[PDB]
């Protein structure tokens, strides 16, 4: 007998580099962008790129001043995407959508190089392998990754190259709301000061694991069949608001110990494979919003009294919508117990 007609697979149109993204395609096109990020571990030499500078040990809390070369930082990147609404109809808006990331760490078998300048493990032995507090992280979104500044020892003096959270108090060793930032510069935001903000990242998807010990093994899988789905509860992924895909990562992979014992960090690059598609969305900003930004860019800037913020002078705002039967409570108080009064102790 004869075989059957082959299975319909998606038709490849072009493979190449970054200048391939700008093909005028149809509506149901799907693109797969593949990229990487080098870890910015400090890089103390031009000769030793990929490690950190050697670590200080026991300086006091009130006398702690690290240098930039011994601080691992975050990696970040913006991937420019082409505009998609050039040939469609009117009143019809359509953006990108990250559907699936497939990540992987490059270079993980290089830790088997025990014949390097490592520390000798016993009297006639091999080199000490890389082990210590690792940290693996990646984030894929249509917006820059929005950070949160938490750091122990708020009297650490950081150098000029690192943008660490400004004006630290004793509440910066715990959750402090006044340390919001964006991850908007490579090799600037150190990892020991900034965690991704769990309240503000609605358009990114971040994944991070770490095992912090004196001697823990870096356990690293490597597989091309694993797949992370980026969709939310409603079925949409990270929408690229501006035509931009924001990719960020930070991979600390333990402590390399030198021949004299002087420890230093080591990181590895991280692969990204983002599967994009064309999500039809609604235009949020008509020409009423768009005209009103011209009047914004032509009105005189007054510098008056604080009508917004913490020191605001607006005492009360009522908002009315429809009709209602006359309430018997003209100060329409909602909380039956806001302060906690008249509860049992």
């Amino acid at each position: 007998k004869k075989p059957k007609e082959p299975v319909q697979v998606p038709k490849l149109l072009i493979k190449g580099g970054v200048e391939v993204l700008e093909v005028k395609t149809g509506v149901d096109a799907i693109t797969e962008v593949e990229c990487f990020l080098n870890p910015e571990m400090g890089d103390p030499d031009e000769n030793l790129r990929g490690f950190s500078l050697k670590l200080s040990a026991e300086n006091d809390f009130s006398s702690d001043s690290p240098e930039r070369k011994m601080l691992p930082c975050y990696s970040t990147a913006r991937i420019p995407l082409p505009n998609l609404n050039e040939d469609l109809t009117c009143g019809n808006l359509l953006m990108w959508e990250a559907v699936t990331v497939q990540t992987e760490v490059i270079g993980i078998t290089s830790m088997l190089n025990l014949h390097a300048g490592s520390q000798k493990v016993h009297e006639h032995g091999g080199g000490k392998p890389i082990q210590g507090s690792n940290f693996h992280f990646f984030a894929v979104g249509g917006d820059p990754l929005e950070m949160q500044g938490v750091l122990m020892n708020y009297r650490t003096k950081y150098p000029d190259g690192t943008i660490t959270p400004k004006n630290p108090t004793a509440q910066s060793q715990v959750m402090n709301t006044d340390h919001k930032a964006y991850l908007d510069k490579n090799n600037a935001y150190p990892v020991e000061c900034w965690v991704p903000d769990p309240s503000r990242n609605e358009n990114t998807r971040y994944f991070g694991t770490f095992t912090g010990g004196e001697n823990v093994p870096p356990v690293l899988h490597v597989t091309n069949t694993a797949t992370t789905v980026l969709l939310d509860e409603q079925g949409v992924g990270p929408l690229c608001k501006a035509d931009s895909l924001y990719v960020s990562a930070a991979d600390i992979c333990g402590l390399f110990t030198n021949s004299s014992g002087t420890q230093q960090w080591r990181g590895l690059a991280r692969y990204f494979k983002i599967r994009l598609r064309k999500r039809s969305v609604k235009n949020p900003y008509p020409i009423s919003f768009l005209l009103s930004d011209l009047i914004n860019r032509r009105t005189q800037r007054v510098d008056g009294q604080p009508m917004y913020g913490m020191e605001s002078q607006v005492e009360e705002v009522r908002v009315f919508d429809g009709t209602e039967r006359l309430p018997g409570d003209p100060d329409m108080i909602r909380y039956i117990d806001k302060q906690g009064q008249l509860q049992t102790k």
């Binding site: 559907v99 699936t100 069949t225 694993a226 797949t227 992370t228 789905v229 969709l231 079925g235």
Partner: peptide, 14 residues
């Protein structure tokens, strides 16, 4: 994460 062979099944429910 998830295997690649079940990927049209996961996206299909939307």
């Amino acid at each position: 994460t998830a295997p690649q062979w079940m990927l049209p099944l996961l996206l299909g429910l939307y």
